[PDB]
Design a protein around this ligand. Structure first.
Ligand SMILES: CC(C)CN(C[C@@H](O)[C@H](Cc1ccccc1)NC(=O)O[C@H]1CO[C@H]2OCC[C@H]21)S(=O)(=O)c1ccc(N)cc1
Lengths: 99, 99
């Protein structure tokens, strides 16, 4: 689709058969989701945002369907104010900015 | 133009004859720029993201030129590591997300 920006670009994602609302976030290098259980090995990582650094769990090769577009990539799980889809997955589903 | 998300979507902005590099950020409600001394009235605000909150100054009706496109609106100024063009001005320059 084409998505305008008068509203937050919130979209439904499917991950592990669960549906969640997430923010398409071009300012985010990485995809970070609120606390949840994902399977497989994870690695402790730290990441910085506007307010400082947080600790996250990094899961690799996780499938997520974003608006019915399939991605498979790195998902961080941690204390984010909202689920965010970052450029690592935005690129896989072919997302660009246009003006 | 069309901006891919392989790299950070940094573009040149102009604010009162200072040129700066800024993120076109669909995950940011409002534009926030690095510490700088804008003229006129402002109000204190806290904005929250990854890692917590920072204190900022909200200036209203500030003209910014973004890649040659004219915008005028709310500009928050505070201790951000990156300059961020948020949805409040992205809409004015005609910026959409597409996939
Ligand atoms: C987390 C979002 C809901 C909101 N953030 C915008 C977001 O695009 C920031 C924008 C951003 C970008 C760089 C540095 C700080 C903030 N990105 C971010 O935190 O991304 C993190 C995940 O991937 C990593 O890559 C960038 C930092 C990491 S925000 O910067 O905190 C923010 C919040 C409110 C406003 N008005 C403006 C900006």
């Amino acid at each position: 689709p084409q998505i305008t920006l008068w509203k937050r670009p919130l979209v439904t994602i499917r991950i592990g058969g669960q549906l969640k609302e997430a923010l398409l976030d071009t300012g985010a290098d990485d995809t970070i989701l609120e606390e949840m259980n994902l399977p497989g090995k994870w690695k402790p990582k730290m990441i910085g945002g506007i307010g400082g650094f947080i600790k996250v769990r990094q899961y690799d090769q996780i499938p997520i369907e974003i608006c019915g577009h399939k991605a498979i990539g790195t998902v961080l799980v941690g204390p984010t104010p909202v689920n965010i889809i970052g450029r690592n997955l935005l690129t896989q589903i072919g997302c660009t900015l246009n003006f």
